[PDB]
Amino acid sequence: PIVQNLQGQMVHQCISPRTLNAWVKVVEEKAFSPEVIPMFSALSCGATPQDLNTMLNTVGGHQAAMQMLKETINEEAAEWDRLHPVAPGQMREPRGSDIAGTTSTLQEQIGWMTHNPPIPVGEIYKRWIILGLNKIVRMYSPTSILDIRQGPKEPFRDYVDRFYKTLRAEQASTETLLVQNANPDCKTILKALGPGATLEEMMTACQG
Amino acid sequence: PIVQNLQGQMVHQCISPRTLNAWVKVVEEKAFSPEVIPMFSALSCGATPQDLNTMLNTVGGHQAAMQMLKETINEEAAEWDRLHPVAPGQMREPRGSDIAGTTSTLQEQIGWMTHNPPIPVGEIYKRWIILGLNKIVRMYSPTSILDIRQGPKEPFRDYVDRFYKTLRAEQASTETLLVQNANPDCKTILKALGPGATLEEMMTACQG
């Protein structure tokens, strides 16, 4: 990454073994559950395109997803080149391939990122990557919100957990449906409570 | 490695126990799966030839691979000496053996790496090593892409994972074949979808 030092200057630092291992382990354990994306974003704080490519490349398996990610990056890079049609010792303008780190060196990336004003190629590339990861989350979301219905004896709290877990995954890239998909006994209670009830009030009502 | 300090100067640092252990553990667990190479590259960021030799030497077993790696390094070193035919207190020019760290001391390596302009012997040697590691990945790749065919009941997503995992390993040192190696039911769907479909669109189509 690029971070501050004692002199207050932005300097490059090696990606740490802790960071490398944390990303490998979250992918292994969580695959492409929605919560993997904010973890990726947090672990790649201040990342250069090189660092982002390092993290993506350290992933073994999940290569269908990684290929979809390549497609998304290709699309975002093409759009950048469309919108940005591009001297000794002077800073050139970054193309899509430079932002994605295929045609740019680490030193060029540092030059752009620490310039005044800065050209944040690390943040731009992360945006494309996060866009692609969100599509993968949506692709691998197993259940439609329409099929999340409360069981006859399922506690309301457990149903609400399933409901909003499903909604999170499905929307990666409500109040009335929650009530409609509730079981007969809680639906009766929720109808009597009426519209305008908070989730807390609904959960309290069907708790007993 | 060589890294920056508060004074903004490039100074040598000891390879850390975290780094040493991480490399030992990734080789133990992953052997020579493709994702081991970017991990090696990341863990050896700013590495001197001495550091690179340390990492390579800490590996127990896998000595067939390590011997192939020696051969590759010998080849790259020979080419360097061919292309670069080589005073009190003055900096000598590095030969192949100096880059590989057999005939150069740690202080000579630091001298070359921190010079202005710098002679990045650490990066040159890493290039040779990564070249050799890629050949080993290719050698130990168990399956040809021609033998990755979708099973009668295998979900398309799982097939695509196998397809691109195999392709990654085989190419270490497509769109039409993916369709041809699909099973009858998905092949029919993919034919109807037609060429020009993205991987995402293909996976969506054969998902049901």
Partner: peptide, 14 residues
Amino acid sequence: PVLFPGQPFGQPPL
């Protein structure tokens, strides 16, 4: 394209 099937992220082209 910037990236091709079966090639690493960051892979230089040509």
